[PDB]
Design a protein around this ligand. Sequence first.
Ligand SMILES: [Cl-]
Ligand SMILES: [Cl-]
Ligand SMILES: [Cl-]
Length: 417
Amino acid sequence: KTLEVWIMPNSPQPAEDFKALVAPFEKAHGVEVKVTVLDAGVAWTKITTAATSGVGPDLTQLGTTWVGAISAMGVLEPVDDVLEALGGEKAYLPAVWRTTRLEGARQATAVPWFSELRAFYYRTDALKAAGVNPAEMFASWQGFEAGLARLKASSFRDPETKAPLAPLCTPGKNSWDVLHNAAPWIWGAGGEIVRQAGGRWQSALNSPESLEGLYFFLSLAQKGYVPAESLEKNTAQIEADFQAGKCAVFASGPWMIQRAQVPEAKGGFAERTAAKNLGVAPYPAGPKGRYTFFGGSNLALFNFSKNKPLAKELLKYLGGPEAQVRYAQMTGMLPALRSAWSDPSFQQNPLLRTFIQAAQFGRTYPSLAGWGGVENLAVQHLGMAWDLVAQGRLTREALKDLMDKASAAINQALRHH
Ligand SMILES: [Cl-]
Ligand SMILES: [Cl-]
Ligand SMILES: [Cl-]
């Protein structure tokens, strides 16, 4: 009776890394664990098909935003026992603990595996030449826009491109990335994507505070601080532009830290000026607070598994300190288990300590059963606002009107089962 785990492509050799990760467990339990890697755009199909049919793995990886929807289908084994075994609620950042259950449930259905959090990379050489103190550019909204204005004015040129750097690269192409790149600006203004109000869940995208945050961010791209060509690039293309010395500032996760230490000859960018002049800073505080976007993945046990006892031991293993530290070398992500962040692999690296500083401000979306329909509508409407940005036509009224249509659509979505 062999355990079957479904994972996503979390690391460069994902199945191999998973197998090396669980080798100690396999030896101590005298078993092999079988792993299947789901590519990005079959994963949700496969996991919902397993849920409806009862034909599936023992364990599956779930994105943190999927936990509510799969939990609500009645197919996940409770794992409150596993979480207690790992230290309970105090073992996690609150934003991470929120991803263990359907929103408002008392019962956990997912075990935190790894976190994806986002912070600003910057060129230390470019900010020095522009006269910009990184501490004050990334401390506040006013600092951030003043930094980008100095970066625009700067005579500095990249030593290898012999060209100027764009102040800020951010994508404007409807993807899940656009809502998470917007979320800290929404949150820092005092806004939300959805909230509880008046006895219901509702959109808050058209609240004055959400609109202040969204407008602050999107307007930077209309002020000359984001190149036109950045708005149609995906997240991989923006990362490649930063490596190639085209971008002074961009937002990413911790994986870029490792890639900057790997030579070009093995797929990294150690040789590039950007690697040798690399800074990280958390998102700036808005007028109502400082937030860092959390996502990542959790693990869940299908309650139709015939191997539930062994599968819960594997959940405890994967969720626990040693496996949390090890997998992080492989994924480029932060452990979901907060005690793992003390490991010297993080604490002896000044850029990873900065991500752990950023982590203290972590926030995530509400764990709603209907989150994916909310996020689809939010992303489509935000991409309509980015499309106005591409024309130089985003005004506060135009953004309000888009978010009023977003919020009508969201509100109707949340009214349905
Ligand atoms: Cl949260
Ligand atoms: Cl929210
Ligand atoms: Cl306006």
